[PDB]
Design a protein around this ligand. Sequence first.
Ligand SMILES: Nc1ncnc2c1ncn2[C@@H]1O[C@H](COP(=O)(O)O)[C@@H](O)[C@H]1O
Ligand SMILES: Nc1ncnc2c1ncn2[C@@H]1O[C@H](COP(=O)(O)O)[C@@H](O)[C@H]1O
Lengths: 209, 209
Amino acid sequence: QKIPVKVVTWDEIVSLSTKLAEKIKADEYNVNVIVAIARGGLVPARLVADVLGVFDILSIKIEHWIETASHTPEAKVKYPFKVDLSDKNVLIIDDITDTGDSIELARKYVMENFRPTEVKTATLQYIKPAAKIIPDYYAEEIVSWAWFMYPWNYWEDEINLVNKILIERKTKDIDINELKRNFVESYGIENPPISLDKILTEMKRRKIV
Amino acid sequence: QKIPVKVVTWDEIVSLSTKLAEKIKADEYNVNVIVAIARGGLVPARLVADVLGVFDILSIKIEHWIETASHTPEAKVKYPFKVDLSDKNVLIIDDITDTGDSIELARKYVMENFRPTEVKTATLQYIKPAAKIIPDYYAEEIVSWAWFMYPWNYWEDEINLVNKILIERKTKDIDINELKRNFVESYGIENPPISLDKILTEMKRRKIV
Ligand SMILES: Nc1ncnc2c1ncn2[C@@H]1O[C@H](COP(=O)(O)O)[C@@H](O)[C@H]1O
Ligand SMILES: Nc1ncnc2c1ncn2[C@@H]1O[C@H](COP(=O)(O)O)[C@@H](O)[C@H]1O
């Protein structure tokens, strides 16, 4: 019931993305086109592009589905489309490789539908114990699984982290102090980036509570 | 020869994106799909999506061309594609509306090729004196033109700001000191986010110097 959670700051993001870009520079892979995996790869993609000097960024939206009986995970491109990337070197970027299902799909999808000269993959982080596929480049290796709460994800993650606590209440009333307490107890965050009261207001607006 | 330049921080970006999202909430425009304009709108798009709770983000790459004799500006979609967005409300996002050429193209392109039920435009900033087109939503109105140096653009902008000084030199100069001095004199930046020596090394790697 405890989930190890790490709050990632903008500075750490900048540091990771820059470190990622440096590895690509040092490998002298000449990138013409970045394909960001939406939504997680949008920010890292922009930052890496700034460091490497890439002007062409495209994105594909990859969904993550779980079959509720079998619990089978499946990644899936939504709003799929084709463009002609022949004669381009492509770099695919995402935030973090966990199982590697997303980058595996992205690579396969790009090879088949964009037809680049060459394709490489890159993520800010990479979880060694969990990854079936390892990205060509990564800034930081993670040897112990944890949920990484990125600065572009603060609202969404907190909304979910709060909901995982609320769905075990046993009282259709919501006590905020109890909530804050459980947040510290379950996740180890005493000062969430977004105050839990704002989260609750937004959860109501979204009809989650 | 002096260019007014404002260095925008991550916190200001967060503040702007959140303020932008709040306007959209208050207007009760129910967004199904965000179309980010690459590259400038990628980050703001992600952040606004986090605040509003939007899961579907697509992007289109808009280029900005100038004809060198006539000086005619033209915005252009690169790697154009079509997807079916019928029955969706779309929000198009970019960093800043200057002339409004980009959002005008984006809106026209999205209406014609994605065919959404409805399309609105949004930028973090909006320059009143320059904009032919005004976005449906903006976080901050600017009444006096300035170059906004965004945190996802620090390398690129500094590379250009340095180049604009170097292309008036004297004789293949070096000296990180005169450069730094001119930077302060021309732009008013005493501490660039990226150190100028860092920029120079990267300029050589890119064969700009
Ligand atoms: N440990 C984690 N922390 C934060 N985000 C994650 C984590 N694992 C997976 N994700 C998200 O899930 C997506 C898919 O990762 P994967 O399991 O490699 O397909 C990534 O793009 C991340 O946005
Ligand atoms: N004053 C400015 N500061 C920073 N970026 C700008 C500025 N004006 C234009 N841009 C960039 O140029 C693009 C086109 O703006 P527009 O002139 O409205 O077509 C925007 O997406 C910005 O990324």
